[PDB]
With several copies, the nearest count.
Chain A
Amino acid sequence: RREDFSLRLLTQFPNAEKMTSTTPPGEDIKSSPKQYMQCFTVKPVMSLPPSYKDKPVPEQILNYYRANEVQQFRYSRPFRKGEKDPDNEFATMWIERTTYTTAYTFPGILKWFEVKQISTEEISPLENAIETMELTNERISNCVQQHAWDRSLSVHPLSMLLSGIVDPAVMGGFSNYEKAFFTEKYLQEHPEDQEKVELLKRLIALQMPLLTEGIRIHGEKLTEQLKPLHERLSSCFRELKEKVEKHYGVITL
C-alpha cells in the first residue's frame, strides 16, 4: 500500500520531508534547498493488446496485459467545480486526471523510471457519472464472467456487489443521476449536453441486462442464506426494471 512505499523511500533518504499537495509541484521548492518529495499511487493505463482488438479473449490474457507493458498513467483528481450541495457530492466533482507518459514500459531493466511527459484533463460530473457507472458495470461483468468459467468459487463478493449496487443505501446514486442530469434544470445548465444524459440513459439501459446476468447468476449460485438477499434483489430489480422502462424513460433492449 501507498505509505509502506513512502516509508521505504524515506528510508532511502535523509531529510525525510514530504510534499502534501500531492498533485501539483511547488515553485519555491523548485529552487529552495531541503529536498522535498511526494508519494501517491497512480493508475496503470490499460495496455493495447495487439491483434486482440475484438477476439473472444479469455481472462488471463487481459489481466496480464492489465498491469504490464504499460507506458501511460493517469491520476484522478477530485475537485469541486460548481455549487456544493450538502445532500450530494456530485454537483461539483471535476476530475483533472494527469497523464503520465514515461520513456519505456514496465517491466523494464529498472523497477522504476522517470516520466518523459505529463498532461492533465478536466472531467464533467456528467462524464464522471458516465464512465464511473460504466466501469462499475464492467466490474459486474468481471464478477459474473469469472464465476461463469469458475465454479469451485467463493460466491461471497457477488453478494458484496449485489448488496452495494442494489441499494445505493447510504447514498442514492440513481436518484442522484436523475436530479443531477435527468432533471431539465441541468438541461438548461447544459441544454445541448442532453447528448450526454442520453448516453447515461443508454448506460443504465445496458446496465439492466447486465444486472440481469447478476441476478440470474445469483439465482444459480443462490444458497439459503442468499435467499432473503435475493428476494430483496429481485424485488428492487424488476422495480428498477420498470424504472428504466418508464420512470427513467430509457428505451430498453
Chain B
Amino acid sequence: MPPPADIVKVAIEWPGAYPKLMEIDQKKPLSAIIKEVCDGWSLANHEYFALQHADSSNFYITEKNRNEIKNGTILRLTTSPAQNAQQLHERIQSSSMDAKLEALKDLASLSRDVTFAQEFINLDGISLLTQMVESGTERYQKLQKIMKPCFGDMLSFTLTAFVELMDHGIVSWDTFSVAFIKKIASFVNKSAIDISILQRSLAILESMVLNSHDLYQKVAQEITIGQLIPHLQGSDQEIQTYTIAVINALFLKAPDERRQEMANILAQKQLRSIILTHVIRAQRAINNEMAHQLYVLQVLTFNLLEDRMMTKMDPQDQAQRDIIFELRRIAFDAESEPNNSSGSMEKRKSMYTRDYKKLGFINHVNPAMDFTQTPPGMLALDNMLYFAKHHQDAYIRIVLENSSREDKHECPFGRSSIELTKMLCEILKVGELPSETCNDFHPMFFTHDRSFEEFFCICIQLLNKTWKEMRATSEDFNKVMQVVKEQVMRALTTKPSSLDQFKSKLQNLSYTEILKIRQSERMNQEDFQSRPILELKEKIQPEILELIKQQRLNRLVEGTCFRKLNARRRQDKFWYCRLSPNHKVLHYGDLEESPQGEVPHDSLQDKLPVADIKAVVTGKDCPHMKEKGALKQNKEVLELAFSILYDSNCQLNFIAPDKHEYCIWTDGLNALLGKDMMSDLTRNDLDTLLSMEIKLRLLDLENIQIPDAPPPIPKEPSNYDFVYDCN
C-alpha cells in the first residue's frame, strides 16, 4: 500500500536548459509538475511537452512511467508523446531526405516507448512508413538510383520502426501495403546488400510470417529456399540467424504436406550440411540463438519424420507387407532358401514360427505386430530401408546373428528395431514440436541428412556387439536395452559432434574399461552422499512427508486469524479457519476480529470439502488480484494472497498473516489435493530430519565400513530342512 519515496531530488532538464534541482513530490497530477518545470523554462502550452528521463530511454514521462523517477535520474523535458507523434507524421512522410533519415532514426529509437506508441498509433504513422518507403521510393527514383546506399539505410530504419511499432499491436499488423513486401523481397530476392537492410528485411519476412498464415503464403513467394541460402553465405552471424529463422517459419506455417517437401528441399540444397560448415565447425559462433536455430532445423527434420512416427499405419497393408518382406529377405536370406521369398500362406506361417521363435515374437502370425506400436511403425521400416541403402552391413550382420539363434539370446529384429527407434526418438527429441526452450544443438545431426538413421544403426551395432560381450538375452531385452540406452547417454553427455566421433565414443563406451571410471565417479558422488545409503533413505520416504503433512493439517485445524480481500476498514484482517477433525469440513470465512482466533462453530463459510476444491492459485494468480477495480490490492501480499477454486464462481481470494504460515496452509491443502508441498520449510525440515534419521541408523555398523555396491548372494540349501528349526 504505502507509496514509495515521492519527494525525490532529481535533475530536471530541457535540451538547452540548465537543470534546477528541487524536492519534487510525485503525488500531484503530472500536469502540475510539468507546469512548474515549463514555467521554470518559461514554457507555456504544457500539454505539448512531456518530461522524459535523460536516461538511455529517452522515454516521455506520462503517468505510466513516473515511478521510474529515482534520486539522481535526470529528467529531460521535451515534447509530449502526441507532439512527437505529430512531429513524426510531418518529418517521416515528407519529401525532405535528411530530415526523414534522422527523424526515422528517432522514430526507431522511440517506438519502444509505449507512451509514445499510444498517440503514434492513434496517428497511424506506420502507414506513413508505408508511404515514405513505397511512395517515396518512386518519387526520388532518378537520383536514388545513385543514393541507394543511403536510400537503403533510410528504408532499413523504416523497417526498424515498422517492427518496433508492430510489436505493440495496438495498430494491426497489416499496416504495410504490398509494396512494402516488394521492397523486402528486393532485399531478400536480390544480390548481397547492406547488413542493416538485409537484417531488418529478414526480420520483417519472419514478422509477416508471424502475423498470419495468409501473410506467410504471400511472403513465401518472396522467400525461396534457393535465395534464402546466400543470406547464410552472407558470412555475418546475424544474417545467418534471420535466414535460418525464416527457414523455421516456412517450416512452421506451411501445411505438413508442404513441410515434407521443404524438408526434402533442405536436404537437397545442403541446408543441413551447409549450415554445419558455415557455423558449427566453421569460424562463426554458436550463440544461444544459433543453438536454437540449428536445434529447430534438426527438430524440423525430426518432426517431418514425426509424420511417420505419431500415427498407427496399417500393419497388414499389402504394400508395407511386401516392403517388410523384401527387407526381411535382404536381411535373412543369408540363412534362407530361395523358396520363402514368395512362399504360400502356410509356408509364411511356418517360416514366421521358425524364424521368429528365433526372434521371440509373441505374436508370430504377423511380424507387423512388432511394428503395430508407434512411433515409429513404418519409420522403423524406413530405418530398415536406409540401412538397405546406407547401413546394410550392420543390418545384415545383426539380422544373421539373431537369425542363427532360437534361444533367448536373440535380437528380435522387428521388435528390437521398433523399440530402439522409439527410444532414441524420445531421447534424441526426434519428432518433437520445435520450441526455443531446449537451447542445445547437435552437430552430429548436421553431419548427415539421416544421422537419425545412422544413429539407430550404430546403436543396434553397439547393442549386439555388447550383447556378445554381455551375453544378453531377451528376458533382459528390456534390461540390456536400458544398458544400450545408458551407452547412448554416456555418448550424448559427451556430445558427439559427427559420425566419426560418435563412432569412437560409442566404441569406447563398449564396456572395455571406462566402466571403472564412471563407477569411480559414482563412488566419488557417494563419498559425500552415500548413494546406496541414499537408496536406503529415500526408499522409505513417505513416512516423514506424510507426518509433515498431517502436522501442517493439524496446523490448519488450529489455524489462524486469517486475512481477507482488502481486510482494512473495520474489516476482519483476523478471522479463524479451523479444520474440524472431519478433515472434510473447514470452519472459516468472514469471521470476527478474533483475539484467540478459532471458536469452533459453523463458521460464516462453514463448509469446505476437497470435493468443491479444484486447486489454488497464489498471489498475482488470484483473480481478485487480476481484478483491476475495487479489488486492487497491492502486490506485496503476493506471499499472502491465494485463490482456491470451488464452484468456479466463489473463490478463496484471501490474504495470509505472513509468508511461512501461508506456505504451511498451502502445503496442507495440497495434501488434501494429494500433491507435493509448497513450503521450502517443508523441504528443509524433511531433508535434515531424514538425513539425521539415517545418520541415526549408522549406529549399528560403525568402526567397520560398508560394502556400498550390492554383494552377491551366498547360496542357500533350497529346502527348508532346517538343522535348527525356526521359532
Contact = CB atoms under 8 A, between A and B. Distances in A.
A and B touch in the complex (CB under 8 A): yes
Interface of A: 7-8, 11, 14, 16
B602 interface: yes
B344 interface: no
B646 to A, nearest CB: 16
Contact of B606 (A7, A14, A16): A7
Contacts of B584: 14, 16
Interface string B606-624: 1101000000000000000
Contacts of A11: 580, 582, 585
Nearest to A11: B585
Contacts of A14: 582, 584
Contacts of A8: 602
Contacts of A7: 602, 606-607
Given A8-B602, A11-B580, 9 more contacts: A7-B602, A7-B606, A7-B607, A11-B582, A11-B585, A14-B582, A14-B584, A16-B584, A16-B609
Those 6 A-B pairs whose CB atoms lie nearest each other, nearest first: A11-B585, A7-B607, A16-B584, A14-B582, A14-B584, A11-B582
B587 to A, nearest CB: 10
B583 to A, nearest CB: 9
Interface in B568-613: 580, 582, 584-585, 602, 606-607, 609
Interface in B113-145: none
Nearest to B609: A16
B589 to A, nearest CB: 14
Q: Is the interface of A mostly helix, strand, loop or mixed?
A: helix
**Range for the number of chain B residues in contact with chain A:** under 10
Contacts of A16: 584, 609
A5 to B, nearest CB: 12
Nearest to B583: A14
B240 to A, nearest CB: 66
11 contacts: A7-B602, A7-B606, A7-B607, A8-B602, A11-B580, A11-B582, A11-B585, A14-B582, A14-B584, A16-B584, A16-B609
B710 to A, nearest CB: 46
Nearest to A15: B584
Nearest to A13: B582
Contacts of B607: 7
Contacts of B585: 11
Interface string B76-105: 000000000000000000000000000000
A15 to B, nearest CB: 10
B679 to A, nearest CB: 28
Contacts of B582: 11, 14
Contacts of B606: 7
B339 to A, nearest CB: 65
B605 to A, nearest CB: 12
B554 to A, nearest CB: 18
Nearest to A12: B582
Interface string B623-642: 00000000000000000000
Nearest to B607: A7
Interface in B64-83: none
Nearest to A4: B602
Contacts of B609: 16
Interface in B456-486: none
Contacts of B602: 7-8
Interface string B505-537: 000000000000000000000000000000000
Interface in B47-79: none
B584 to A, nearest CB: 7
B599 to A, nearest CB: 16
A8 to B, nearest CB: 8
Interface in B209-225: none
B557 to A, nearest CB: 15
Nearest to A7: B607
Nearest to B580: A11
